Design a binder for these strands. Structure first.
Ligand SMILES: Nc1ncnc2c1ncn2[C@@H]1O[C@H](COP(=O)(O)OP(=O)(O)O)[C@@H](O)[C@H]1O
Lengths: 1178, 397, 133
DNA sequence: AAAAAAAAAA
DNA sequence: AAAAAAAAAA
DNA sequence: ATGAGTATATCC
DNA sequence: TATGAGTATATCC
């Protein structure tokens, strides 16, 4: 790979400076991704003074700081800067301490600090602290305390160095040293003098100082190499004690962040988020009340005008205050919520974008007890405060108010930073947010949890980005929350509702990072369409648009051609063969079917042994008492053993499994080893002596790469070809699988070297492996049975939410899964979740990529694997014509067992879109009562439904309601695959938005439209034509889901009904101008009549009792609202037969069940017209 | 043992050791529970952190160890005297342990000897009276320095909580006991007058250019400033702040503000302590088995939490006087009088702190010392007889 | 330090003049000499000495001649003011008869300091009561 | 119906 | 003057 | 900015 | 009544 290509990518990314972009490069492993990116980074850093890059990797072995040093030496030819003040390696606290004590032991400290006694005693106490810390690395609860002690010791060492340099630079250390005998703060000029002193210092000692303490001068480091675990966390600056987070630091602004394993980063981020969310928990009621009091203090002009002026003048502030006051009045949040002890564990509540969930089943209910002056919470049926409404409503208010405060904090920070003269000590957004929260009288913990709700994600305010970011993925937009109720004698009078919010998915973190820095992501599998082991590329594409570049549009075409190997292998005549490991109940096939067997009853002895070993397990009672599966796994492994054994041409082998052989009967080293030793001489004469087996694992007392090298060397010079047993996890990407060319390899070797490389390259004098055994990769989805509010439970729920967003599972599966968790029961993995099979294929591809890092290769690479593995590999969304040849032939073999995704994915996409639309319109009815803007959005989108029912993508995205909402609220149109006009759906459940698009029962098309049953009515079709509501549905891409079709039908019916009612009874039915009258009724008249219209079809499976109770509650609300005694009329439009209004025994209610028949002509009797007429006026 | 050098690491090392010892105790608890057929997990929690057993289960465990062979019971009782602390007639312990808390068996949180029912009507034999006083004094000093809080926010939060009590926004249990006393109305009036007088609704911002601020001491004889020039404070109306600094302008009498708020806090906390005592007495009537009764400390913490105060604010407010509320008009027997001002007022310390994460105001960290060893001894004598023994028990010093 | 000085003030062993001087010295890191006629200092010194000498009085058999060796400062610091020497060990009585050359009078300065402290406390009480009244 | 004790100035 | 999305019931 | 010269004990 | 079936890596509090 040419370095110029990566330089072009870097300069293209730097060209995107104001609106930073994300670039992803797909290049197969073993090619020069890391090498050439290091060379290009060094070259660009040398050429450009202000360029700053973060080389972020996932594992400590992939930093390649030595490779950076070599590249820096090679690229620099004029100044050859010391590489220590320009390239930095930010390591952990433990690693820094390890380096410090190693330097102390090996006299590597440049005798300026070693001589001083204070530095000495700091080193001895630091070494003692590190010894204790290492002694206490077993448990994690006490890891925090040990880390704190280590940090304190390291800070003491840093303070010793600071005072040494202070006395060596004549700087007034005294100012600090007296006024700061603990805090030890300095000013900009003193540290500048120290830095310029160490600048002119000799090379060796300054070199050591810069190498061990990169944070000594971070604004001069052009390249910063670190692990992503450090990148997410903070760095502790020199001359300071409080660590500063990378995320908010100014060092990321306009920087270029290179993620060396792009897909692998998400996982590292996700858990780093999850365990963070669990560390930050606060009482919900106290948090809301304190925030409300702080905002009210701001309103009354008690905060300094510096931010009071910024707060008060915005209309959103008054809206927030009114909303908080209404919430406090509604939920009695001024009073204490007390829950009497439940005896048993009260469990917890969870809210996900699809539903609430109670881990105990019985819902939680709360009501205000006036005699007790309290709020009683418990399992009692009395629920007057709507607790299940209380929790999400308060969480939503907190999210919105915190976003408002974050905007104000951004303004405050940008104003305060201008006054400062020195730019080396400006305040970050986190400091501004914490300052504002502390100004409102909020505790540090409350400030922390409030800040952690959206952090610093704001999105650009300008309305000319030329691309509208939109997405219908609810989990990415609102996250999930967890609530736990706790009682304690220390606060005996009240029950604490501890809340935990997870709002920052790894995709949101990446988008937030992209708001201030360009990102280049390298990986062999950077764009695999899985949402479990890779970012949600669909969501990222939706939210980025043109800002999501592709790295292949910059590689030289020669390299692109070189990526393919299927022509290279044929030139050298390399054959890769794969066969299935068919196995049944007992070992009847692991034995060679050839009629040369010597011992028959010894096979029965082996079968009895394996039966005994699988019957010695007492784990679970299902799956044949957990014995049937394990035996099949063992027999597949031994089939691999035999197949490797018979062939003498197999130089090496790697039977990668998903288990490390251990003590238990699942996988044990002793049984496998004895079985291999038996089969050695049980089959063949030279096979037993030539073949060997060696197991590499972390269960041993030695590293993994070195023992793998030992086995490959035993093959190299010991002359015995070996079988190597491992796990997919113990040997990942970044590990080598090549050995020297043995004589047997020497006489059966071949080369696939490209053109332009010598015969002594690193990849030229190594050879590859002879074939792998692929066992079943497992655990893509978590299966932790004890579902609790911990990291594992959050991981499970988050994986399910990720699946639901990517349209891989539907609502019924998610509900079934949640109910199973409620009963400590797990459900079957979804059978058509593309992410499962893509992740399975991803781990297999990563395993197969380790045998393609060298030029020299041997032929006839035979592959053996279990049948179940063949069932779960896929090529969907994978560049099959650009991946490894071994995976290519594996897919060729799998062609018999490949399953379809397009049809199930489309079906689930339709179901999820309809469900999301239904939930959106369910929220609209709840909120429409309070505000009036959301009424404008509802009206606009409801009319957009009938403006043009069938829409193209271009027309829909470039619209008025789709353009300002920043998501797809109520506009989740379907996709007409055949560009059709009509479709049939079977509704499973109407009041949950569940539809099956492979069924029948409700057809949606022009049958429910103007041109039938209402166009023929005079004055009605002409109005629709004037209202731009076409009666014919044009055949284009997108159509309305059933939830949207419901509103379409309702709007058409309501317009027609209002028109016909006004025509028949000759009056103008005025509109409800009262904001309180939302959801009250359709129309009003003469102060005592309320009129409601409906577009329902003929008599459904609905009883009259439901209508009676609905109108009863509605009229109770109406009398409570308008302070009168109203009487109600309700209308059904269509009726095939003579159906006349039915009155109550007292005449209180009027219900007409049909006006116009299915031709569009009037049907009602004129006597009934007179009846309605004199009932209307009373 | 390795981390015994630095006292900063002593806290963390002690916490780790306590966690390990608790795990050992949990293992022993499970071993004894299965031998007594007690459903631990069910009593505790199928999950982890729990083991909250009922009185009956631990009673069964105690019965089992009582009927156990003598060597086993002897080892268990020697190693863990707190296994059954009610049966122990004589309890031998150091002064430092007596001041602090003992951790009960079967529980994770430790209970202080100070408020435990184990002291009621007991006889305390201090065999090194008078050597104990220094020890107690030293401990007191350490405790005083551990507990600090921002004075302005503390006062504002307490005033807000008391006003909530006034408007009947707390459960009737304590609300009906707060409101019928004229002292409550007077406390509310003083809180309002102090808030209006010292502009305590607004933020106190103290601008430093980097010079050390020192601290301010208040002793029963005088105020004291460690850096000479007295602190002054005025209300900047244009900034809507209270400017605090070394300027000559003093429109708010800062050196008067500091002790006045402290006096108000001490009095209000005494009132709340009386109300918490009433609440604890009333609540202990409801309890049937008087084995899990709430202590005065629990009642005070519950009252403070119900008022909306933080845990740290509750600790500092409760430490202004620890359950000392005197007898009852001495039943017209003897008039306890004293002219020693330091025993009656203690002393206070105040330090001003500026941090970039609360850039808009200056925190006035307060530190009150009120419990001299003599007051601790008197408070102990409010609930137990004391016998003091030494050859120098009455040396005048 | 502050609490020790407050204790001395409460027991009428230092007056407001000495406390003010001590506080002024603390403002400058120039701590003053210990009070010369504070009974508590000498009584505490004597208490430590008495406890030490009690470690050789736990038996009925004693050597015919006992020797107590100390520097002159111990002689100068011990005293018998409020200490009932009658019910004290013979060793301490002999030590006192040896240290008689430096015996101090504490009753007088204690009396005048008590008068001064009572007057100061009354004045502080009235300064408070006017402002509160 | 049992809250305390609050000068300036050095 | 760019804060969000809230129903029941299982 | 001089007077004066410590060891013992135990929870967060 | 109902399933799937690990090892491993890294950093701050
Ligand atoms: N252009 C190149 N020059 C030297 N070595 C290369 C080159 N390309 C690949 N390699 C070697 O192949 C191996 C893998 O390539 P590398 O550059 O590390 O990227 P990746 O790790 O993504 O495969 C490394 O050992 C590397 O030295």
């Amino acid at each position: 790979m040419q370095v110029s290509d990566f330089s072009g990518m870097i300069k293209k990314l730097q060209s995107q400076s104001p609106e930073h972009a994300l670039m992803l490069l797909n290049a197969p492993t073993g090619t020069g991704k890391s090498y050439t990116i290091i060379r290009a980074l060094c070259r660009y850093a040398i050429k450009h003074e202000n360029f700053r890059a973060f080389f972020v990797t996932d594992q400590k072995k992939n930093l390649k700081e030595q490779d950076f040093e070599v590249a820096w030496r090679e690229e620099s030819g004029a100044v050859h800067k010391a590489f220590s003040e320009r390239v930095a390696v930010v390591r952990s606290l433990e690693d820094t301490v390890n380096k410090l004590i190693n330097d102390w032991d090996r006299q590597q400290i440049p005798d300026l600090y070693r001589s001083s006694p204070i530095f000495k005693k700091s080193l001895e106490n630091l070494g003692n602290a590190f010894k204790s810390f290492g002694m206490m690395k077993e448990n994690e609860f006490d890891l925090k305390n040990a880390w704190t002690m280590l940090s304190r010791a390291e800070y003491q060492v840093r303070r010793a160095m600071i005072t040494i340099l202070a006395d060596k630079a004549h700087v007034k250390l005294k100012n600090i040293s007296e006024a700061g005998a603990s805090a030890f703060k300095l000013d900009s000029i003193s540290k500048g003098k120290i830095r310029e002193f160490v600048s002119k210092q000799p090379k060796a000692d300054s070199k050591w100082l810069n190498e061990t303490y990169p944070t000594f001068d971070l604004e001069k480091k052009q390249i910063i190499i670190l692990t992503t675990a450090k990148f997410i966390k903070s760095y502790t600056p020199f001359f300071e004690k409080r660590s500063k987070a990378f995320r908010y630091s100014p060092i990321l602004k306009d920087a270029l962040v290179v993620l060396d394993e792009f897909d692998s980063t998400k996982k590292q981020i996700l858990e780093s988020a999850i365990d963070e969310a669990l560390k930050i928990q606060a009482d919900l009621n106290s948090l809301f009340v304190d925030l409300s009091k702080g905002l009210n203090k701001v309103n009354e002009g008690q905060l300094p005008a510096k931010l009071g002026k910024s707060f008060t003048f915005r209309d959103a502030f008054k809206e927030i205050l009114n909303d908080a006051e209404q919430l406090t009045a509604e939920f009695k949040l001024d009073f204490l919520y007390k829950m009497e002890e439940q005896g048993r564990d009260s469990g917890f509540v969870m809210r996900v974008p699809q539903t609430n969930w109670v881990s105990v089943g019985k819902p939680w209910n709360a009501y205000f007890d006036e005699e007790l002056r309290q709020v009683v919470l418990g399992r009692q049926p009395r629920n007057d405060l709507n607790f299940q409404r209380m929790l999400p409503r308060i969480s939503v208010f907190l999210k919105g108010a915190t976003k408002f405060i974050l905007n104000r904090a951004r303004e405050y920070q940008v104003s305060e930073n201008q006054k400062l003269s020195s730019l080396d000590d400006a305040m970050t957004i986190e400091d501004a947010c914490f300052s504002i929260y502390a100004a409102l009288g909020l505790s540090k913990s409350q400030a922390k949890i409030l800040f952690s709700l959206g952090h610093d994600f704001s999105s650009p305010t300008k309305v000319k980005t030329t691309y509208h970011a939109h997405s219908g993925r609810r989990f990415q937009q609102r996250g999930l929350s967890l609530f736990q109720f706790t009682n304690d004698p220390q606060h005996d009078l009240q029950t604490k509702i501890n809340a935990c919010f997870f709002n920052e998915t790894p995709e949101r973190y990446l988008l937030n990072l992209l708001s201030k820095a360009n990102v280049l992501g390298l990986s062999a599998t950077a764009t695999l369409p899985t949402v479990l082991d890779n970012y949600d590329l669909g969501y990222l594409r939706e939210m980025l648009g043109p800002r999501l570049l592709d790295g292949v549009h910059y590689l030289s075409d020669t390299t692109i051609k070189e990526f393919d190997f299927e022509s290279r292998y044929a030139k050298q005549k390399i054959e890769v063969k794969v066969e299935t490991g068919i196995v049944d109940r007992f070992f009847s096939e692991i034995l060679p079917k050839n009629n040369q067997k010597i011992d028959n009853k010894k096979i029965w002895e082996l079968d009895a042994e394996l039966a005994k070993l699988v019957n010695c397990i007492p784990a679970s009672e299902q799956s044949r008492i957990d014995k049937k599966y394990f035996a099949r796994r063992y027999l597949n492994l031994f089939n691999s053993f035999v197949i490797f054994l018979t062939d003498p041409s197999m130089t090496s082998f790697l039977g990668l499994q998903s288990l490390l052989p251990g003590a238990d009967g699942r996988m044990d080293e002793n049984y496998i080893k004895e079985t291999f030793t038996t089969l050695k001489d049980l089959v063949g004469g030279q096979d037993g002596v030539n073949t060997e087996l060696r197991i590499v694992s972390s269960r041993n007392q030695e590293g993994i790469q070195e023992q793998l090298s030992e086995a490959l060397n035993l093959v190299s010079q010991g002359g015995k070809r070996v079988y190597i047993l491992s796990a997919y996890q113990t040997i990942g990407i970044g590990q080598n699988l090549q050995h020297e060319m043995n004589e047997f390899e020497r006489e059966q070797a071949a080369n696939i070297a490209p053109k332009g490389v010598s015969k002594s390259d690193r990849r030229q004098h190594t050879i590859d492996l002879a074939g792998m055994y692929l066992g079943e990769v497992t655990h893509i989805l978590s299966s932790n049975l004890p579902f609790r509010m911990d990291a594992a439970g959050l991981r499970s729920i988050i994986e399910q939410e990720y699946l639901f967003d990517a349209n891989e599972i539907n609502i019924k599966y998610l509900n079934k899964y949640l109910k199973g968790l409620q009963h400590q029961r797990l459900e079957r993995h979804p059978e058509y979740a593309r992410s499962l099979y893509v992740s399975y294929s991803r781990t297999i591809i990563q395993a197969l990529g380790r045998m393609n890092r060298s030029f020299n290769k041997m032929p006839l690479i035979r592959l053996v694997m279990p049948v179940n593995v063949l069932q779960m590999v896929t090529d969907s969304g994978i560049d099959v014509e650009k991946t490894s040849q071994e995976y290519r032939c594996l897919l060729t073999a799998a062609k018999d067992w490949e399953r379809d995704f397009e049809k199930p994915s489309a079906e689930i996409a339709k179901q999820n879109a309809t469900f999301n639309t239904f939930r959106d319109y369910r929220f609209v009815l709840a909120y429409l009562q309070t505000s009036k803007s959301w009424a404008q959005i509802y009206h606009d989108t409801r009319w957009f439904y009938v403006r043009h029912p069938t829409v193209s993508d271009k027309d829909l995205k470039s619209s008025q309601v789709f353009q300002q909402r920043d998501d797809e609220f109520g506009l989740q149109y379907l996709l007409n695959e055949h560009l059709d006009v009509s479709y049939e759906v079977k509704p499973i459940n109407h009041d949950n938005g569940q539809f099956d698009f492979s069924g029948t029962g409700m057809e949606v098309s022009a049958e429910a439209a103007g041109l039938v049953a209402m166009c023929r009515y005079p004055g009605l079709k002409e109005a629709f034509e004037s209202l731009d509501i076409p009666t014919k549905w044009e055949p284009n891409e997108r159509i309305l889901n059933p939830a949207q079709f419901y509103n379409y039908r309702g709007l058409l019916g309501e317009v027609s009904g209002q028109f016909i009612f006004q025509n028949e009874w000759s009056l103008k039915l005025a509109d409800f101008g009262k904001p309180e009258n939302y959801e009250l009724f359709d129309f009003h008249w003469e102060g005592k009549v309320v009129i409601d219209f409906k577009n329902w079809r003929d008599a459904p499976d609905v009883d009259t009792k439901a209508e009676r109770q609905k109108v009863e509650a509605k009229l109770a609300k109406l009398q409570a609202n308008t302070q009168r005694e109203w009487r109600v009329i309700i209308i059904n439009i269509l009726a095939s037969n003579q159906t006349r209004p039915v009155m109550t025994v007292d005449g209180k209610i009027l219900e007409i069940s049909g006006l116009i028949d299915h031709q569009g002509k009037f049907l009602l009797t004129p006597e009934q017209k007179l009846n309605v007429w004199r009932f209307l006026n009373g």
